[PDB]
Amino acid sequence: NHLSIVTLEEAPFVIVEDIDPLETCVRNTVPCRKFVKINNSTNEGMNVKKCCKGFCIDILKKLSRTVKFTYDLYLVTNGKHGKKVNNVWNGMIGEVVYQRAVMAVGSLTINEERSEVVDFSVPFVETGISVMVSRGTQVTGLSDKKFQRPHDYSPPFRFGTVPNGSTERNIRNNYPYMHQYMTRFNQRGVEDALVSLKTGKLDAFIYDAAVLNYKAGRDEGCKLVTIGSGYIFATTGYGIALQKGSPWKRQIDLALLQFVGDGEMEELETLWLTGICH
Numbered sequence: 001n002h003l004s005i006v007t008l009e010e011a012p013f014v015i016v017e018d019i020d021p022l023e024t025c026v027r028n029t030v031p032c033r034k035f036v037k038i039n040n041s042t043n044e045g046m047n048v049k050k051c052c053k054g055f056c057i058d059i060l061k062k063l064s065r066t067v068k069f070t071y072d073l074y075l076v077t078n079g080k081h082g083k084k085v086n087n088v089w090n091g092m093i094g095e096v097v098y099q100r101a102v103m104a105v106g107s108l109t110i111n112e113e114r115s116e117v118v119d120f121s122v123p124f125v126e127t128g129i130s131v132m133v134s135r136g137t138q139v140t141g142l143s144d145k146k147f148q149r150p151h152d153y154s155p156p157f158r159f160g161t162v163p164n165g166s167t168e169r170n171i172r173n174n175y176p177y178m179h180q181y182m183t184r185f186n187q188r189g190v191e192d193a194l195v196s197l198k199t200g201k202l203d204a205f206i207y208d209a210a211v212l213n214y215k216a217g218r219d220e221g222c223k224l225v226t227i228g229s230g231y232i233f234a235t236t237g238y239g240i241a242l243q244k245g246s247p248w249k250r251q252i253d254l255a256l257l258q259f260v261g262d263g264e265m266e267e268l269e270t271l272w273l274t275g276i277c278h
């Protein structure tokens with residue numbers, strides 16, 4: 001009963017590394033494969049062996065040990081965390097919905113749309129929407145006038161997010177103007193956004209709270225500050241996604257609860273998520 005499990009890279013939850021040519025993953029890593037295309041024309045491709053580590057990987061290792069299952073971990077190839085595009089789910093959520101994976105482990109945010117098509121374990125990392133700015137910049141949260149009336153400033157307040165995730169969904173579904181203003185500043189990824197902030201090319205980066213709290217905690221030079229958005233309606237957590245009606249949610253939940261109660265979760269948080277910047 002080898003379980004097919006999908007994941008996605010997003011430090012410090014999931015970190016990917018090339019395997020050692022001379023061909024096994026060691027230390028705190030585990031095997032993870034990815035289907036890579038031969039070219040940009042056809043569907044042809046081959047699965048490439050890589051190695052994975054991180055907070056979520058350690059959670060997977062513990063679940064494997066405790067629930068007593070073995071697994072075949074693979075990386076998503078189309079999309080990221082999960083979005084319904086042209087009426088079809090992609091990313092980690094898609095792999096679970098279309099039964100390619102029994103579970104999805106990673107920095108996967110629990111939200112209403114996703115819960116309609118997949119079942120989630122209890123949350124194990126708290127998150128929501130946060131705002132990151134250069135240390136010194138003053139903002140109260142997303143209700144700040146700088147965000148409500150960006151054009152009332154010279155130059156217009158510059159803020160954006162990484163599209164296609166739960167953060168964009170929460171803005172697009174409720175505040176049309178803010179969303180369409182923001183697309184002007186879409187960021188390709190977290191690292192891109194951080195550079196834009198520290199060099200003064202971007203005023204604020206709106207993104208997942210867990211990741212922003214982590215990044216601000218160990219920024220080189222501690223030049224970044226993260227503050228809550230105030231969008232409490234968006235407060236949620238990361239959860240392991242399973243097939244709708246999955247018979248494993250019960251056992252996965254019991255394990256997570258066991259880890260929380262025994263202090264094992266506490267130890268993992270200390271190992272991977274602590275910060276140093278005040």
Ligand SMILES: N[C@@H](CCC(=O)O)C(=O)O
Pocket residue numbers: 081082107108109110162164165166167168207208209
């Ligand atoms: N963790 C988010 C991705 C990042 C974000 O949109 O804030 C998700 O599962 O969609």
